Amino acid sequence: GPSVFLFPPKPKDTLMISRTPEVTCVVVDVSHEDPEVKFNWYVDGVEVHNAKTKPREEQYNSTYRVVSVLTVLHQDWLNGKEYKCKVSNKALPAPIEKTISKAKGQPREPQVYTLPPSRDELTKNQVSLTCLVKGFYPSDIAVEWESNGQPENNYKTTPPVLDSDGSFFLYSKLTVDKSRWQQGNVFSCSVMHEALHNHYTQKSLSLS
Amino acid sequence: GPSVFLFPPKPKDTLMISRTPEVTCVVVDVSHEDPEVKFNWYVDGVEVHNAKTKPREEQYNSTYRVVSVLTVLHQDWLNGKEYKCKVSNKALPAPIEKTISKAKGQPREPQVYTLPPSRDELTKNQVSLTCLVKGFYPSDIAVEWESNGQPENNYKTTPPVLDSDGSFFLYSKLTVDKSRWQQGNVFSCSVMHEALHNHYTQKSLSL
Ligand SMILES: *[C@@H]1O[C@H](CO[C@@H]2O[C@@H](C)[C@@H](O)[C@@H](O)[C@@H]2O)[C@@H](O[C@@H]2O[C@H](CO)[C@@H](O[C@@H]3O[C@H](CO[C@H]4O[C@H](CO)[C@@H](O)[C@H](O)[C@@H]4O[C@@H]4O[C@H](CO)[C@@H](O[C@@H]5O[C@H](CO)[C@H](O)[C@H](O)[C@H]5O)[C@H](O)[C@H]4NC(C)=O)[C@@H](O)[C@H](O[C@H]4O[C@H](CO)[C@@H](O)[C@H](O)[C@@H]4O)[C@@H]3O)[C@H](O)[C@H]2NC(C)=O)[C@H](O)[C@H]1NC(C)=O
Ligand SMILES: *[C@@H]1O[C@H](CO)[C@@H](O[C@@H]2O[C@H](CO)[C@@H](O[C@@H]3O[C@H](CO[C@H]4O[C@H](CO)[C@@H](O)[C@H](O)[C@@H]4O[C@@H]4O[C@H](CO)[C@@H](O)[C@H](O)[C@H]4NC(C)=O)[C@@H](O)[C@H](O[C@H]4O[C@H](CO)[C@@H](O)[C@H](O)[C@@H]4O)[C@@H]3O)[C@H](O)[C@H]2NC(C)=O)[C@H](O)[C@H]1NC(C)=O
């Protein structure tokens, strides 16, 4: 029969009060013969009725895909409430239930260090600016780069890696033209995480 | 019926002449009623005969596990030859064949940079020494830290990450007591990869 996948809000959405975090319930392999789908939503067991469901969408493998979106409160998600999606369909003997909640664990504050290019890399046309983010827990986190108040997006960030003390670390690498570095332009690594004060910190990096 | 899993050599094994790279053919769920297992091995379609096979070993679920190991030549593996394991068993309508080979794609040479701790971290009891390895392809690679003729224990390396130009990068983080760093000890990041000259390079870092 059909299948359900339940997805969390984005970390940045839960950590910045101005943004709009959502939980999303996706149902796939919904047949043409029985396309009717009912969603029930629960927060710590209590039904809520503010979910928005989008219309059937025919796939290329001749099935329907149907999506329901629940807006969540920032502080409910961060406080560990459980979000349950129940999907009912004529083709299901019993409805499918999926539950999701924030990654558990005692929070630990990321330490954020910026590292300039190696001298050896200055022979290249482009150089690497590095942000080390370590000692954090749980692993949900957002790391971004900017300069003069504007996003610098030519970067890649590693997945979180479990360290030997049970916390996580990652590195983000921003590539910039060497000339911008050598001209003394200032770059900053921004980190958003539940265990930071105001859920945000920034560290700068430039050539002296 | 029985099942076959074919495993490659470890990348480091293929890169250093001192080591012995092997391909391993394991067959599981071999029955008591039909316990006989025959291996045939091929390299680019040509049968080879120097594989070493171990005797059946009964498992706690009352089936046998039987392993055949083929030693490979380092340069054959790196040159992309294909290794085929054919497994024959009376309980099989037809023999099972599995094939394995090195990852494809144009190789690219890693660039290796060591980075000292940030000034802000020097207030801590332990500090982080960083090895950036970038611009490499394929993603198979070994990264190790040493100091004073001995490997270091407290390091972790990220998985390879696909960069915007289609090569990979990673970072390796070595944690040492601040005192060792301040005393001027030299640390070294060694990298082994098929696209390096002699498949090896090293970069050092000290205060
Ligand atoms: C017929 O076709 C359909 C769909 O059409 C195909 O789908 C695409 C992907 C291509 O493959 C093409 O072939 C077609 O277009 C098939 O539907 C697929 O079924 C799969 C199951 O058989 C299912 O696999 C599971 O994937 C999970 C991951 O899903 C992610 O990621 C995939 C790939 O990265 C992506 O395609 C999905 O869209 C989904 O992506 C996320 O979607 C959410 C929802 O919007 C995005 O939303 C953001 O998230 C939050 C929400 O609150 C936030 O608030 C934001 O507001 C919001 O924007 C989110 O951004 C997306 N993330 C990413 C990274 O993209 C896996 O987790 C899962 O594995 C786990 O479970 C398995 C089962 O137990 C385990 O084996 C496993 O170990 C794991 O535990 C599955 O592998 C596909 O997702 C699903 N595809 C779609 C589009 O729904 C259908 O199967 C097929 N039928 C037949 C018979 O062929
Ligand atoms: C009776 O008991 C038997 C022994 O206990 C059971 O045997 C087990 O059978 C299953 C399949 O039914 C096999 O599962 C496969 O494992 C592959 C990986 O195996 C490696 O890693 C596991 C986990 O650590 C380890 O136990 C294995 O021994 C093996 O280790 C590797 O061995 C090689 C060769 O010596 C060595 O070079 C490696 O270094 C070493 N690695 C490590 C980490 O130690 C999986 O990759 C297989 O995946 C298949 O299925 C996937 C499904 O998504 C698919 O994506 C893949 O592409 C692939 O098709 C597969 O899951 C077990 O390995 C096997 N155990 C042993 C010891 O052989 C037997 O099942 C049981 N029978 C019954 C009826 O109960």
Curated annotation (Swiss-Prot), chain B:
Disulfide bonds join C25-C85, C131-C189. Signal peptide: none annotated. One of its GO terms (cellular component) is extracellular region. Residues 1-104 are annotated as: CH2. Residues 2-101, 110-206 form the Ig-like domain. One of its GO terms (molecular function) is immunoglobulin receptor binding. GO terms for biological process: adaptive immune response; antibacterial humoral response; antibody-dependent cellular cytotoxicity; B cell receptor signaling pathway; complement activation, classical pathway; complement-dependent cytotoxicity. The keyword Transmembrane applies. Residues 105-207 are annotated as: CH3. It comes from the Eukaryota. Glycans are attached at N61. Changing L122M: In IMGT allele IGHG1*03. Keywords: Adaptive immunity, Cell membrane, Chromosomal rearrangement, Disulfide bond, Glycoprotein, Immunity, Immunoglobulin, Immunoglobulin domain, Membrane, Secreted, Transmembrane, Transmembrane helix. Glycosylation on Asn-61 is required for interaction with Fc receptors and ability to activate the complement pathway. (Microbial infection) Deglycosylation on Asn-61 by S.pyogenes EndoS or Endos2 endoglucosidases prevents interaction between immunoglobulin-gamma (IgG) and Fc receptors, impairing ability to activate the complement pathway. The keyword Cell membrane applies. Immunoglobulins are composed of two identical heavy chains and two identical light chains; disulfide-linked. Interacts with FCGR1A; this interaction mediates IgG effector functions on monocytes. Interacts with FCGR2A and FCGR3A. This is Immunoglobulin heavy constant gamma 1. It comes from Homo sapiens (Human).
